[PDB]
Design a protein around this ligand. Structure first.
Ligand SMILES: Nc1ncnc2c1ncn2[C@@H]1O[C@H](COP(=O)(O)OP(=O)(O)O)[C@@H](O)[C@H]1O
Ligand SMILES: Nc1ncnc2c1ncn2[C@@H]1O[C@H](COP(=O)(O)OP(=O)(O)O)[C@@H](O)[C@H]1O
Ligand SMILES: Nc1ncnc2c1ncn2[C@@H]1O[C@H](COP(=O)(O)OP(=O)(O)O)[C@@H](O)[C@H]1O
Lengths: 54, 375, 31, 375, 375
């Protein structure tokens, strides 16, 4: 039960590790997507302020 | 407590037989696909002693028995031994007689048709079952897992079938079947444990290796890096207790065996492994049916219970897959038993009560009826 | 954000030129 | 849902179906003219799954469906599938049963008679509509655009009819029916995409190519100059996402698809293009008609939404048309929806209440009545 | 061993490659389009053993090799393996040096451009061929068949082209190109032979099934009547001897494989079938074209060699075709070799000498020259 619980604990440590990685990947991907997406598309709307001038 | 003619469900592989009645969420008992027979000359008399032992009986008295498994790569060849297993299964543990209940049996979609015809014939002519239904194992995992859509990768004991299903429909042209299974993994491990100084050849020895594999082995996510440290340090070794009190300590063999599923060349097969067969099934499906199979990588059967497998399979498909697509794996605790559970679900559906072959239909048509009524 | 600011500026300039053009055409048409 | 017995209006061709009630400024719902059917054998039981899918249902589950259009090249041939479309089109989304509401449908004078006869017959005999009218789409585009005079170049999905109207009168001898439409533009594009390594054959693949066309392609004003750059530099290439994660990069092929409208020989048609047909419809009319038709070239229907098409047409037509005279195109944002809008305008005019075929007249005369009453 | 400074001809596809010199009526030899590589670890040394094997070498030593072909449904992707095949074919088997001879290679006119560009480029840049000409397979078929007019069904290993030609002109709007071919028929046969109890997985197993198909499979004149008996009685079964002495007996599966060409759904393909696509190529053409195409259904490539294919195709077309017209199949002994033979004819025609790309022109223009001079 211990080896199994340890497997579960280790599983959870690994699953957590995989998710520590995937949370950071999502933290970095959400970050990067926002950082590039609102920063670029919002910038593109700033550019609209100028693009659509004239 | 069976006061209703519920269908019986029995999933029979090269490895284990899972059986129980429809309506439950688990098999009531597991009969490990076996009929055992003594290989020695008797000296004492009045010792009882059977000509053959079945299921758990074969394992309990295995010290002097040769153990024969009736199913090869998911195909029943020793039908007489399956009758012994089914009689024991249904009457001694489930406490039912098939004569009073519909019975559902299972098999891979490309399993030679003779197998589905014999399963139908045996239950109707030997057990007098009032009705029959041979089910697809891939389907049953999808019911158990809550899916109608996905690639079902049945990495069990016999054969890995790999069949894409979309919205409840088969996409059979995209089936990528492999002669890669749990019984090849055991043989590989017997050979690499021999390399370490622990030879395994005979039946008792084969059973030990199978048990070692199930309890000590894993796949992890990166074979070469896992091997680099497993081959360098005792920190990745694990000990196993052999039946006679001896101890075997296993290092990179702990993962080299499971790795065969990703590297079939380990057992002499010209194949790229289960993650590419899973991926190709997605690829071989229509352009508007791939965006759903990528998001639904579905596990079925055993070996799916190796540590690191849920993430390695999602990772390997993701690596093979194009970007933008979302890749996801379904790997529920109903693992190693999802097919049985699906059998219970299917047998019990109101929409399935017309799918059963009745005994009268069988007697009029014969064994070939299974291809007209089941699949 | 849609470039609605210029769908609207376009129409204004379109009207300004269409009116100047109407006049260019009339001015020539008048002989 | 309606507070008056307002007529229902629907523009239903070989491409799409636009529907709503008379008096609005837009269709309430838009569906493709598609009835889908499964092309696979079901494997799982209790999955629902329809025998046929209609409109948006057909596209949503298209991964395993074969998708057919009941209307081809401007004409209904599959009347059974049209009954399913009309029910979905007018009742499932608008919630209005035709039984209590007059219905206005569209075509053109060179559209074979069976189209107008089946449109009228189905709504009277299957939906019991109290009244019917079949309109020329050109009439409706001109009402929507605020005109009585002009050429309506409808460049649709299965046919281009190019119908001239002067001061509210049809000029049928000058209609130029051309065997070049959006469905052929889709076919051209998949062949040129094949030249680049992307072959599209199945229904799903066909629907994807139509999506690529609708979002990536353009006409531009000068194809020789556009090609000189597009064929020389990646700066004019655009990526499209296939729904499986693959990316298709399209270059001068991006305008060579719509270029067919100015080069019908690309699909084997003996024609110089839609600006030639616009020119000829005007040319075939007396000169006192022509001056007003040239000054009012009207875009309606499909393909009018390709960037550069309204301006390309004015340039191509003025290049054929006599000098001094002003050549102009009417191409409002109410493009492609102008036919539906005109239907709303016409159906609701007080003077049009005398133009409806009533059910009593229909029952006495039979299906051919539409030929006596519409135009 | 050749006695003239003639052109070389090589019809190198996804299946097999045929080669000989221009001016003959047959290739000198046919080789599989294969480059083989060892899939096993060597134990003995001084055994020779190549890194790669080509054509007959690849098949002869296949027991320990994994075999691959460079052409994917008609498209070259592995240009390095093409180099190995062309080198061996021209240098060792035709016993010529490409440097001293013009070379003609082949491809469908709708084949992706990279294919024609690499064929032209490799022969000029790695082999230094003095001249090149990528030929249209449909042209070559008609020249071998004694026709200028007809529908060319090259139904090969890779793709079925299906193109109408009239008076030497292409009618491209009517090419009903189809992704249904001999390579799919082989994989289909492997799955149905698995259903019968004879599993095939590996390259050797695939080569065996291909050999079974080529000797035992047929189309039949009537699929429904043929299966009614073949699936019910041993009288229509035919055995095949596997190289290891095992015997496989095949019944209706013997025709189900070729039936797939008429019934594409057998491999998950959405298609009308080769006879309906042939019919549509005829029907898509003008009224004064159709009569000549009905009388001239022209065969080339593999699959045209299945017994009953010429006759089932003529029956399927006459059954769809109008009366008065005489519907005829042209299925000469030059079957499967129609393209190679046509290649010899085209390369040698005096009216074709100006069509050759010279090395000097190639070097000045680059690889894109193939589209200026060939097609
Ligand atoms: N932890 C594990 N490690 C290795 N293999 C496993 C594990 N769990 C299950 N499997 C294998 O899968 C088999 C049981 O799963 P299953 O797919 O249901 O086989 P079956 O066809 O008999 O029903 C056993 O033979 C076992 O060796
Ligand atoms: N952006 C676009 N680019 C190319 N084609 C378009 C675009 N928008 C609409 N169309 C085309 O509109 C067609 C349907 O037009 P429609 O004129 O309303 O048929 P009809 O009037 O004869 O009933 C479809 O083929 C669709 O591809
Ligand atoms: N007896 C046969 N019956 C049916 N097909 C055959 C037979 N013999 C050879 N073939 C097929 O011929 C094909 C190769 O010939 P071919 O079509 O001329 O090459 P290419 O596509 O370059 O034109 C292979 O698919 C092979 O299986």
């Amino acid at each position: 039960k211990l080896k199994e619980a340890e497997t579960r604990a280790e599983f959870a440590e690994r699953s957590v590790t995989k998710l520590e990685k995937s949370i950071d990947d999502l933290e970095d991907e959400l970050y990067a997507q926002k950082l590039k997406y609102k920063a670029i598309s919002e910038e593109l709307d700033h550019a609209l302020n100028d693009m659509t001038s004239i | 407590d069976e006061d209703e003619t519920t269908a019986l469900v029995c999933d029979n592989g090269s490895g284990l037989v899972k059986a129980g009645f429809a309506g439950d969420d688990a098999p009531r008992a597991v009969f490990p696909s076996i009929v055992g027979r003594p290989r020695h000359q008797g000296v004492m008399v009045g010792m009882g002693q059977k000509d053959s032992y079945v299921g758990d009986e074969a394992q309990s008295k295995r010290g002097i028995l040769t153990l024969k498994y009736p199913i090869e790569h998911g195909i029943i060849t020793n039908w007489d031994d399956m009758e012994k297993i089914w009689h024991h299964t249904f009457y001694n543990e489930l406490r039912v007689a098939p004569e009073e209940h519909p019975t559902l049996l299972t098999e891979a979609p490309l399993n030679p048709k003779a197998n589905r015809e014999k399963m139908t014939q045996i239950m109707f002519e030997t057990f007098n079952v009032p009705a029959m239904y041979v089910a697809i194992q891939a389907v049953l995992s999808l019911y158990a897992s809550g899916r109608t859509t996905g690639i079902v990768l049945d990495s069990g004991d016999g054969v890995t079938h790999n069949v894409p299903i979309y919205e409840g429909y088969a996409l059979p042209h995209a089936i990528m079947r492999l002669d890669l299974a749990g019984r090849d993994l055991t043989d590989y491990l017997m050979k690499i444990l021999t390399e370490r100084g622990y030879s395994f050849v005979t039946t008792a020895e084969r059973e030990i290796v199978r048990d070692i594999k199930e309890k000590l082995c894993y796949v992890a996510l990166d074979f070469e890096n896992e091997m680099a440290t497993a081959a360098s340090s005792s920190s990745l070794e694990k000990s196993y207790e052999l039946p006679d009190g001896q101890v075997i300590t296993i290092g990179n063999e702990r993962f080299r065996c499971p790795e065969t599923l990703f590297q079939p060349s380990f057992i002499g097969m010209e194949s790229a492994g289960i993650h590419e067969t899973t991926y190709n099934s997605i690829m071989k499906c229509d352009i508007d049916i791939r965006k759903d199979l990528y998001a639904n990588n579905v596990m079925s059967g055993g070996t799916t219970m190796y540590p690191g497998i849920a993430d390695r399979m999602q990772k390997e498909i993701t690596a093979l897959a194009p970007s933008t697509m979302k890749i996801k794996i379904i790997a529920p605790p109903e693992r190693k038993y999802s097919v049985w559970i699906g059998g219970s679900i299917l047998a019990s559906l109101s929409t399935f009560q017309q799918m059963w072959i009745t005994k009268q239909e069988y007697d009029e048509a014969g064994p070939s009826i299974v291809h007209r009524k089941c699949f | 954000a849609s470039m609605d600011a210029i769908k609207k500026k376009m129409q204004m300039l379109k009207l300004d030129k269409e009116n100047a053009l109407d006049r260019a055409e009339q001015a020539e048409a008048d002989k």
